[PDB]
Each structure stands twice: as C-alpha cells, then as structure tokens.
Amino acid sequence: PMKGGDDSHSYSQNSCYQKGVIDAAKAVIVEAVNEKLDLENNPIFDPIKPFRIADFGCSTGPNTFHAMQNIVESVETKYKSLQKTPEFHVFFNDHVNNDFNVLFRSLPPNREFFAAGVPGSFYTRVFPKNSIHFAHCSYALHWLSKVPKEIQDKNSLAYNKGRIHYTGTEKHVVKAYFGQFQRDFEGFLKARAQEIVVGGLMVIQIPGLPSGEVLFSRTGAGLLHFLLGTSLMELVNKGIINEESVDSFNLPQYHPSVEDLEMVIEMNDCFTIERVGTLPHPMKNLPFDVQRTSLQVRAIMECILTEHFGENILDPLFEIYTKNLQENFHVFDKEIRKDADLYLVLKRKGNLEH
Amino acid sequence: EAHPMKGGDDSHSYSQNSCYQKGVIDAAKAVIVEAVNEKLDLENNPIFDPIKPFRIADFGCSTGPNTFHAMQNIVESVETKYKSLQKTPEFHVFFNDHVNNDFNVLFRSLPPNREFFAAGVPGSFYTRVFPKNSIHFAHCSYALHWLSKVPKEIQDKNSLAYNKGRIHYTGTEKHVVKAYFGQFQRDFEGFLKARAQEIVVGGLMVIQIPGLPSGEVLFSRTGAGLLHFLLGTSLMELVNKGIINEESVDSFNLPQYHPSVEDLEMVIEMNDCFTIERVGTLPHPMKNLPFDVQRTSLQVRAIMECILTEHFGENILDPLFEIYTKNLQENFHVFDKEIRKDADLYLVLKRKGN
Ligand SMILES: Nc1ncnc2c1ncn2[C@@H]1O[C@H](CSCC[C@H](N)C(=O)O)[C@@H](O)[C@H]1O
Ligand SMILES: Nc1ncnc2c1ncn2[C@@H]1O[C@H](CSCC[C@H](N)C(=O)O)[C@@H](O)[C@H]1O
C-alpha cells in the first residue's frame, strides 16, 4: 500500500496528482450516472433497499472521500428526479495492511452514507454476489498482484537485468508484464462481475498508454521509473548498494493501452464498454515541479523500496533522484505526452446478453 | 465519548489480555446454537432467502481474537441449519466498534481461511451504523455495560449524587447508583432503537453483558465491582502521595453500569421492539481457576488505559498500576473465594413483526 498516517511524508499529503484525476473524473461519474444508470422502473435499483457503492484501492483519503461523495451526489440527484431517496452504503476496499485507522478517523463528519472498510486484495472476491450497484477503481489497477516471476529468474529469456521496470523495447520483459496484467485484470473482472448487479456501473481510472504509443519510456510514468532505476545504479556505482539488489528489483506495475484493456474486457465478456477515454489532467498547464514530483514518487514507492532495500536507502536515493529530474526538466515539462490517464465506464451485462 | 481497548498486538494489548472475555464467548457458543436451532425461522421464509447473503454484525468487536470466535460460532450454526434445508448462502460479517478502535490490528488478524466476507464499521453503536432492515443476526458481547457518557449529576458538586473520592459505585451510594441506572436506561434504549431499525423481522440479537448476579444488590460483590473499587483506592493512594491531585479523582468516573436481569428486561419491555426468547446467566469456564493477580491487573490496564490516559496524564499509568497490582495481591482471597463469579448475563432477543 501507500505510505500510511497523515504525516507530511504520507499519502494523505502527497497524492494531489491523483486528486486532479478524481476532479476531472467527476464529469465522467456525473455523465455515467445520467446517461447509463437505469434507475427508472428498475427493481435492481429499488430505492427501498440500499444503494451500495464500493471503492477498490481506496487508500487513506482524502481522494476516496471525494470520489465517493461524487458518486453519492450524482446518484442521489437522479433518484430525486424520480421522487425517491435511498439509503447509501459505501464500502472502502484496500489491502489488509492499508491504514484503515487513518481512513476511518478521517471519514467526513457530515457524511450522509453508511460506511464500511473492506480489507482484501481486489484480485479476489471481497463482497457477496450481486450486491454492488456502483463500483469505482482509481489509480490502483496498474499495480500487479506480483512481479511476473520469469523476470526475476537469471536463467530466463525475460530476465530484467540492470533495470527496475520496462520501457517497451525489451520484448521478452514487456511480454512478461503484459501476461501478468492479463491474468490480474481478468481476475479483477471475474470477481467484479460476480459482485456487481446487472446494470450496475464500474468506473475505472488507470495510468496507461496514450493510443498509438509503443514506448512506455515516453510517458511521464515510464521516464520516472527509468530514472528511479538509473538513480539506484548510481548508488551501486558509489557502492552504497550492490548490483544484485537492483537486478533483483522490479516494479509490479503494467500501464495498459486502451486496446489492452478492451481485449481483456471483451474476453471476460461480462461487462459492456460504455465509454473509454483519457483524463485531461488539471495540472497540465502548470510548470513541472521537480521537488513535488520527487516526493510523490517517494510516497508511492516507500513501502516497496523499503521492503527490498533498507529504509536507509530512501534519503540518499531520492536526493539522487531529484538531481536526475532536474537534469531532465525539459523532457518532463515539454516533451512527454501530458495525457496518460485512461478511464473506462463499464456496465454489467444481463444474464441473457452473454 | 469513545474509550476503546488498548490497541496493537503486543503483550500489553487487549488482543493478548482478553482471555476472560473469550471465556464468555466460549460458554455462549451453546446459547448461539440453541437460539439458531429453535428460534431462527429460516425454513420457507422470504426474509432469510439464501439467494441473498446472511448478514451478521458484532457490536463492540474490539481487535480480536474474541470477535472472530463469536462470528465463527454464528456462521457455523447458521450454516448447519441452512444445509439441513438444502441451501447454502453467502455470509457477510460486519465488525463494529468506535472510530478509534484499532481496526488495522483487527483486519491484519482476520482468520486467513474463512467462509465469510468481512467488513469493519466504525461508529458508536448508540447510533445507526447500517441501512434499515439489513441485519439477520446481531451479536454484542461485553460492550453494553459501557455507557455513552458519565451521568452528569455525579459530576455536579451541588448534587447529593456527586461521586467524591470514588470512580464508580459499589451499590450503597443510592444517589450515584440511581444516576448510573438512569444513564443505562437511556443508552440501552437508544441501542435497542437503532438495532430494531437495522434487524429484519425475526432476526436474532444475542447479548452478553457483565451484570448484577441473581439475587445480588451490591455491585461491589462482583469481580468487576471490586476491581473498580480498588482502582479508585489506588488512585486515592496516588492522591496521598502527591502524584495526582484530589480534584482529578473527584472529577473522574467510569462510564459503566452493570445491570441486573430485571434492569435489562425493563428497558427491553419499554422499547417494545424485541421479544426475549432466552435470558439467564452463563457459567464461566475459568470459575475454578485460582485468581491471577498479574494477568487481572494487565487485563484491567488493557481495558482502562485510554480513558485513564485521557483524564490523567499518560505519566500516571505505571505508578497507578504498580499500586493496583499491590492492592490486588492484598485482596487475593476476596477475589479467589468471596466474590460472586456468576455475573455474566446473556439475552437472546428476536425482532418483532408489525
Ligand atoms: N490488489 C489490490 N487490492 C486492494 N487494493 C490494492 C490492490 N493493489 C493496489 N491497491 C491499492 O490501491 C491504492 C493505490 S493509490 C490510489 C488511492 C485512491 N484510489 C486515489 O485515487 O487516490 C493503494 O492504497 C494500494 O494499496
Ligand atoms: N458506543 C459504542 N460503540 C461501539 N463500540 C463500543 C461502544 N462502547 C464500547 N464499545 C466497544 O466495546 C468493546 C468492549 S471490549 C469487548 C470486545 C469483544 N466483544 C469481546 O468479547 O472481547 C470495546 O472495543 C469498546 O470500544
């Protein structure tokens, strides 16, 4: 998970990039509710029973509370156009060692929904069948369930020596990450298909590839990852860590294209794609912020870098990292495509529509 | 307001110092099974349709492991009765406690191989925490003796109820006892009112609560009563030693009432939403074991640390419990052979129709 607590070094504080992905997403949520949530004359959405919303990969706030409020307000508005007012039951899902204490203690005091936290991997079932009316998953599905094992094997064609992720040219490494993404995302869709009612909606926001692009190393995320790797190799060359510690390190992430997502969705065959698109990030016009970015990377990578290297490594690594961001300021400010956030609006198919 | 048990899973934590409360749940297993068999009207009942999940809620769950044992007992019993009917539903189990309960520790110790979906619900159970008409089986063990607040009249210097030089009641202080009883009637009624809205017609609620043993009027003749009495005298010993001032003890009181069966029935009749199907006293498994001074002292600290730290500094806990353990030693024979050990009361309630 992300860094816990509500420190200045936490994810409650250094998650503002994902907040703007939520803010321009509000229009995706509002539009999906108004155009595609079939409340009227539909007993699936009977307002005498609760309207159940789930956020998958909710972290610790505040972003999850803004997304949940958006869903609640849109859905409540559509129901009031039919002179109905349901109770809302909102579920916050994340890994078991997500900091749910911090989430619960941050729950908005004036909230008009019932709340629960749901611990467990969303690559598994975490809800009873046929119980979720609106599902939400923002900036979480690029995290794989594991590093694909063959890139950790020295004897494999896919061994990822000297790097910590993929850039898109290493054909064996990229194939391995994609195979892992297919298996993970398929398992996510399998579990969600069982939990989500017929006609229920699922909104997904995920770091991805802009369409047509082959090279992950030409998005922001790809260069940031490439530069985390070279920064670690700088620690190697100073001798502060050994080469083997980096050769054995890999990020468990895959950033899919639209095509990648559609292929898995269509093979799963349980959801119809109602809309797919890119999210124009609000901080698009702003000047590239070398330091703020360094601290957003650290807030994301702290747990996993600390698990593999010492937490000793964080301060000297990210002061090398900031130097490489500054040296690549031009690329990040001007030359990398400023639209790599994809979104999907899915609708659970009826049982006679498969 | 909210005084949860000591968090974490260290050797001073509630999770490692709650063996007496586990004994309560152990002896209650027989009560759960009899209530499911004789009073849970599954067969041909649309309310318990096994195509919908069977929802169980534990109110005052704390951090485990006691809550897991209780929940497993309800699932197994309800499972068995559904099987005898050729059905097999999914179970959705909700763990409710105060917002500042250590839900992280609860979630991290969830039994790995379990046959229910799990969710945590932060919030006071003197309020509504679930949608209406959604819970089929409620459970509440060793929580409902905690009031929502201290009765204001025992804090009033002007009142004959002013609880000077003490932190609870023994039963001889008729004004203090009346105040605590009045607060219990309001709180327990609010609890029942909220559960009545949440529990389905024919749903069961099983309550275990430390109480007044049958035919006993002096709370100080129970283990809990003497433990609180000695915690007050230990505090007054700290006053004598200059470690705390006298006013801080005068102004401190435990927000607890330990009702008799008649106290409980009177509130249940007044609320008029549940029938009492079963009621009695649980035989407690540790009844014949010799009093254990160090564990009892640790159990009390685990329960009281939060509320003691809020009123007195945290600097007061080690000195207070050094004196407390000493006072428990001096009173060994009173706990061992003189206190009434039959103070664990239970209720089986059923939610009434229309
Ligand atoms: N398999 C999985 N199951 C549950 N949560 C997961 C997960 N994989 C990643 N996550 C969670 O997804 C979160 C990514 S940060 C995203 C937080 C929030 N959705 C937002 O928009 O800001 C982390 O909390 C991480 O623990
Ligand atoms: N108003 C309230 N709302 C929710 N939980 C409460 C509460 N008042 C007390 N509690 C909780 O009830 C628990 C009592 S300790 C008992 C825990 C568990 N049922 C067991 O058998 O061991 C504590 O965790 C306390 O925080």
UniProtKB/Swiss-Prot annotation, chain A:
pH-related activity note: Optimum pH is 7.5.
Record's signal peptide: none
GO molecular function annotation: loganate O-methyltransferase activity; metal ion binding
Binding residue positions for loganate: Y17, Q18, H142, W143, A221, H225, Q253, Q296
Outcome of substituting Q18A: Strongly reduced activity
Presence of the UniProt keyword Transferase in the record: yes
UniProt note: phenotype after gene disruption: Large increases in loganic acid accumulation.
Pfam families named in the record: Methyltransf_7 (PF03492)
Result for mutant: Y11F: Strongly reduced activity
Tissues where the protein occurs: Expressed in leaves (especially in leaf epidermis), flowers, siliques and stems, and, at low levels, in hairy roots.
Source domain of life: Eukaryota
Summary of activators and inhibitors of this protein: Strongly repressed by loganin and slightly by S-adenosyl-L-homocysteine.
Subunit structure: Homodimer.
Record protein name field: Loganic acid O-methyltransferase
Organism: Catharanthus roseus
Phylogenetic classification of the source organism: Eukaryota, Viridiplantae, Streptophyta, Embryophyta, Tracheophyta
